[PDB]
């Protein structure tokens, strides 16, 4: 139905970016061997844009968002796994925003629930393996009251964005609460460095937002307001993978695969559901391509197996990567103490190494 | 045309409330010598609930606000503070004063550094009213928002339960307006709950808020009272009074004694011209200022016995306002110089305020 033989060939078609691998090798004495399939997880020129700055010693930090929902599922972990990888490759500061206030505003939660879901989620985020010395994780509700810059930038962004603009970007009506309407300024503020006195304490510092789609409402607004307050707009890591992943996972969710699920619960959920505008882009296939580290394993399945029979090893392949991935994650998350969470959420100076 | 003799008769025909004066002496220990002409200066009804609370020893704190004007303060901007200070004196209660420098930034052509500087400068004028440094927390929104574990959390709670439609009606916002304005009423409501101020009230659940405010123009404060139980908090008490406002020509606090004389003689006490660009619909700005700033209860009665067999209304009323204003501004100007930057820091420093 969805035609996976095409999707495996289309994945194979684009060769690995050896010239970029070399350019990474020069800037940092490192052999990257993942996410280098050409154009997929990032665009060749946007990486060259980053590499320029890293080679020219222009400081930049990574920024990534989060929505604290009561558990995580595998798709939500993907952005962070990639972001860690970037972070290791360039040894760059990372700011992670827990939009707990956002979840309270949009959803049926107590403040305290939304705050508790952020703190708990941070354990899953921390369990992806982020370096503490390059990583600040913060909750909007807590950080707003312990920052001499963050609210000031929120107020600046708020002055230079109208209802009309957010109405046209986010589709807010007049029935919507005033929290929702002014929130986009909160999501935009981390893209500017002086929002964090304790973390950066410095004059300009760019921002880089990986896993980021060009038609994202929050990204579009931040872009638009940035020059109006004389700040540099955040750099965006354009990719085919991420826009398609959002464009796939839009399709109803009841037994989506959770990070709490047992090895059996994984195996059940995959067989009963997985592998069965329209590019014909199955979410289960994109999970395989992201999680597979064996480069030649998809084309190995393709050549051997012939649909119906093909799906069999396609389901079996996803189990073999998801089973150890969730199990290890449970192991790691169990040793992320509340103390370690507070350590990560403590404001403190991050440095630019090269 | 405004009929000033009719208004004096209206004012005068309200009797002096000794039932209140007796009850305040019993509760506080001293008799107040101002603002007790029944119905004029506050709501007698509201003041009784205030007395019930003070007599039952329910802790309450005062909250008033301000947009710090980039141009110098008009005499009428002291009116809320002079009355708020009078409240603090009789009841000996904690007061919280909010500088809404963020409001002024959003509304005016200002830098953040400028708006804050005006907040700090306006705090001197405020402090010069004579508020108790032991019972009074002045704060900048821009500055305090980043130093409080409780304030922003309350903003967010209030934000969820107030809509654009609601604030559109009250404040008259449109889609052309910036999003900061639309969401600003949360910031204004937030000080109505003690736990916005952790270092001031130590997260005690027993405290409530008293908010003096204008009669009729209170539809916002009603909405703030409606949201309180939706987010688990007690409703703020209100103390209605005409002499609170709603939500170059004028008399400034920097003006010379003769500048005061000029401006009154020229602009005051006339149906045509006004004393303040935008000001109880029968009454003038001139008459209200006079009625407030007079401490002599019997002065307007006598201005009627004088005249009606004597001198002119406009002349006699202008006279009475000059003699009332000139000292107030002078005594303000002199006292404002004794307010050093260190005293402002003390007023603006988060610290505990006790009850008595």
Description:
- Helices cover 54% and strands 6% of the residues of chain A.
- The first copy, chain A, is of the alpha/beta class and 354 residues long.
- Chain A has two domains: 1-252, 3-Layer(aba) Sandwich (Rossmann fold); 253-354, Tyrosyl-Transfer RNA Synthetase.
- The first copy, chain A, has a five-stranded parallel sheet with strand order 3-2-1-4-5.
- The longest helix of chain A is centred in the C-terminal third of the chain and has 26 residues, at 309-334.
- In chain A, 38% of the residues are buried.
- At the A-B interface, helix 5, helix 8, helix 9 and helix 10 of A face helix 5, helix 8, helix 9 and helix 10 of B.
Question: How are the SSEs ordered, and which strands pair?
Answer:
2 copies of one chain form a homodimer.
Chain A: H1 4-13, H2 18-27, H3 44-55, E1 60-66, H4 74-90, E2 94-98, H5 100-106, H6 111-126, E3 135-139, H7 140-143, H8 150-159, H9 163-170, H10 178-182, H11 184-188, H12 197-200, E4 206-209, H13 217-228, E5 235-236, H14 241-249, H15 263-273, H16 283-291, H17 297-304, H18 309-334, H19 338-345
Parallel strand pairs in A: 1-2, 1-4, 2-3, 4-5
Helix pairs in contact in A: 2-3, 5-6, 9-13, 15-18, 16-18
PDB class: ligase
Keywords: anti-codon binding domain, H130R mutation, ligase
Assembly: dimeric
Radius of gyration of chain A: 21 Å
From the N-terminal CA to the C-terminal CA of chain A, the straight-line distance is 49 Å
What does the main sheet of chain A amount to?
Answer: 5 strands, parallel
- How does the overall form of chain A come out from the CA principal axes? globular
**CATH architecture descriptor name of the largest domain in chain A:** 3-Layer(aba) Sandwich
Assembly state here?
homodimer
- Could you tell me which chain pair has the largest interface and how many residues each side has? A-B, 37 and 37 residues
Q: What is the helix tally of chain A? A: 19
Strand order of the largest sheet of chain A: 3-2-1-4-5
Helix content of chain A: 40-55%
Name of the CATH class of the largest domain in chain A:
Alpha Beta
CATH superfamily of the largest domain in chain A: HUPs
Number of strands of chain A: 5
Strand content of chain A: 5-15%
Which structural class matches the secondary elements of chain A? Answer: alpha/beta
| CATH topology value of the largest domain in chain A | Rossmann fold
Counted up, domains of chain A total 2
Protein name (chain B): Tryptophan--tRNA ligase, cytoplasmic
Catalytic activity (chain B): tRNA(Trp) + L-tryptophan + ATP = L-tryptophyl-tRNA(Trp) + AMP + diphosphate + H(+)
GO molecular function (chain B): ATP binding; kinase inhibitor activity; protein domain specific binding; protein homodimerization activity; protein kinase binding; tryptophan-tRNA ligase activity
EC number (chain B): 6.1.1.2
């Amino acid at each position: 139905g969805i035609d996976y033989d095409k999707l495996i060939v289309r994945f194979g078609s684009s060769k690995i970016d050896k010239e970029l691998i070399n350019r990474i090798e020069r800037a940092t004495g490192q052999r990257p061997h993942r996410f280098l399939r050409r154009g997929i997880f990032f665009s060749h020129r946007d990486m060259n844009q980053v590499l320029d700055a890293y080679e020219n010693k222009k400081p930049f930090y990574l920024y990534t968002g989060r929505g604290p929902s009561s558990a995580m599922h595998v798709g939500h972990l993907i952005p962070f796994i990639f972001t860690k990888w970037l972070q290791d490759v360039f040894n760059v500061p990372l700011v992670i925003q827990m939009t707990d206030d956002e979840k309270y505003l949009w959803k049926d939660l107590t403040l305290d629930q939304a705050y508790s879901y952020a703190v708990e989620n941070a354990k899953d985020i921390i369990a992806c393996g982020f370096d503490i010395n390059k990583t600040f994780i913060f909750s909007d509700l807590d950080y707003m009251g312990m920052s001499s810059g963050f609210y000031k930038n929120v107020v600046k962004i708020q002055k230079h964005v109208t209802f009309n603009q957010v109405k046209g970007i986010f589709g807010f009506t007049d029935s919507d609460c005033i929290g929702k309407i002014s929130f986009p300024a909160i999501q935009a503020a981390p893209s500017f460095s002086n929002s964090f006195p304790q973390i950066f304490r410095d004059r300009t510092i760019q921002c880089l937002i990986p896993c980021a789609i060009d038609q994202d409402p929050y990204f579009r607004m931040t872009r638009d307001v940035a020059p109006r307050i004389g700040y540099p707009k955040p750099a965006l890591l354009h990719s085919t993978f991420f826009p398609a992943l959002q464009g796939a996972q839009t399709k109803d969710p009841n037994s989506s695969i959770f990070l709490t699920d047992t090895a059996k619960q994984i195996k059940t959920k995959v067989n009963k559901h997985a592998f069965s505008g329209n590019c014909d882009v199955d979410v289960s296939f994109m999970y395989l391509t992201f999680f597979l580290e064996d480069d030649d394993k998809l084309e190995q399945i393709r050549k051997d197996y012939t649909g119906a029979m093909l799906t069999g090893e396609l389901k079996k392949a996803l189990i073999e990567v998801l089973q150890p991935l969730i199990a290890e994650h449970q192991a790691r998350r169990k040793e992320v103490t509340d103390e370690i969470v507070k350590e990560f959420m403590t404001p403190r100076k991050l440095s630019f190494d090269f």
